């Protein structure tokens, strides 16, 4: 249920505390807070940015 | 112009939401109905919808 | 219509804008805002305007 809660945190081949049921749904990265309020969609594109003179506002380069 | 219309549209109407949605569904119909009638590639059904709701309707 | 003789740069355009706003659409304003940034630039350029350790006067 919850590693590391009370007795001695289990540490397997991962050479570190394992990942109990609780904690995969907790923290900053509990399921909640990151796959769930914050998922990671497609239909996207990033880039650097640069002033787009000539191109007016309400427009973007692309 | 469409721009000023888009403005006037919601410069004197119901909840800016309330509008939209009905702009929306409208166009939805504007697309569903008249499905690919005039190509519309330029005047997106949404655009239509707007003008025919921001000038025609007004 | 209100002609305004004043040195415009920061704030002068700020409230301007608003003013516009209220009194006209957004849409317009925007397109104002634009045209004028556009000034902004080109004049700026035209002035040509550089700085330097010397430009750093000393009092």
CA dist., res. A7 & res. A18, Å (int)? 13
A58: left (phi over 0), alpha (psi -120 to 50) or beta: left
> Min CA distance, B4 vs chain C (Å)?
6
User: In units of Å, what resolution does this entry have?
Assistant: 3.6
Q: What is the C-alpha to C-alpha distance for residues C47 and A43, in angstroms, rounded to an integer?
A: 44
Method: cryo-EM
Tell me which H or E stretch contains B46: helix B45-51
Strand partners, B32: none
- Shortest CA gap B3–chain C (Å): 7
Token pair of A33 as six digits: 């807070």
CB contact under 8 A, A56 and C34: yes
Cβ distance B24 to B46 under 8 Å? yes
CB contact under 8 A, A57 and C33: yes
Closest CA to B11 of B54, B57, B45, B56: B54
Integer Cα distance of C27 and C34 in angstroms: 11
Q: Which residues pair with A33 in a beta bridge?
A: none
Long-range pairs, B16-24, Cβ under 8 A, ≥24: B22/B53, B23/B49, B23/B50, B23/B53, B24/B49
CB burial of C1-28 (b: ≥16 within 10 Å; e: otherwise) equals eeeeeeeeeeeeeeebeeebeeeebbbe
Rounded Cα distance between A55 and C43, Å, is 18
| Cβ atoms of residues B6 and B50 within 8 Å | yes
Q: What is the DSSP letter of B30?
A: H
Number of B–C residue contacts, CB under 8 Å: 9
- Specify the DSSP class assigned to residue B40: -
Do the chains contact at C26 and B7, CB–CB below 8 Å? yes
Residues shown for chain C: 59
List, as ranges, residues 7-36 from B with C-beta within 8 Å of C: 7, 11
Across the interface, whether the CB atoms of B11 and C27 are under 8 A apart is answered no
Tell me which residue has tokens 């655009």.
B47
Closest chain A residue to the Cα of C42, Cα to Cα = A53
* Tokens standing for residue C42: 């080109």
Q: How far is C48 from chain B, CA to nearest CA, in Å?
A: 36
* Neighbouring subunits of C (3+ Cβ pairs under 8 A): A, B
The span from the CA of B27 to the CA of C51, in Å, is 56
B25 CB-side CA count, 13 A: 5
Mutant choice from A51, A58, A59 vs C, greatest count of C C-beta within 10 A: A58
Q: What dihedral do alpha carbons A39, A45, A46, A51 form, nearest 10°?
A: -130
Residue A3, classified by CB atoms within 10 Å of its CB into exposed (0-12), middle (13-18) or buried (19+), is middle
């Amino acid at each position: 249920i919850d590693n590391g809660r009370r007795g001695r945190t289990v540490v397997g081949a991962n050479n570190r505390p394992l990942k109990s049921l609780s904690d995969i749904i907790e923290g900053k990265q509990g399921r909640f807070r990151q796959n769930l309020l914050g998922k990671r969609v497609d239909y996207s594109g990033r880039s650097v940015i640069v002033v787009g003179p000539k191109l007016k506002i309400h427009q973007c380069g692309l | 112009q469409i721009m000023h219309r888009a403005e006037d549209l919601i410069s004197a109407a119901s909840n800016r939401y309330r509008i939209t949605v009905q702009v929306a569904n409208r166009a939805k119909r504007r697309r569903y109905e008249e499905f690919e009638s005039a190509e519309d590639a330029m005047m997106k059904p949404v655009l239509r919808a707007i003008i025919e709701m921001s000038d025609e309707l007004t | 219509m209100i002609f305004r003789n004043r040195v415009v740069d920061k704030g002068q355009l700020r409230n301007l804008i608003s003013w516009a706003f209220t009194h006209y659409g957004t849409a317009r304003t925007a397109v104002m805002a634009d045209k004028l940034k556009d000034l902004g630039f080109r004049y700026a350029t035209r002035a040509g305007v550089s700085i330097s350790v010397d430009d750093l006067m000393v009092p």
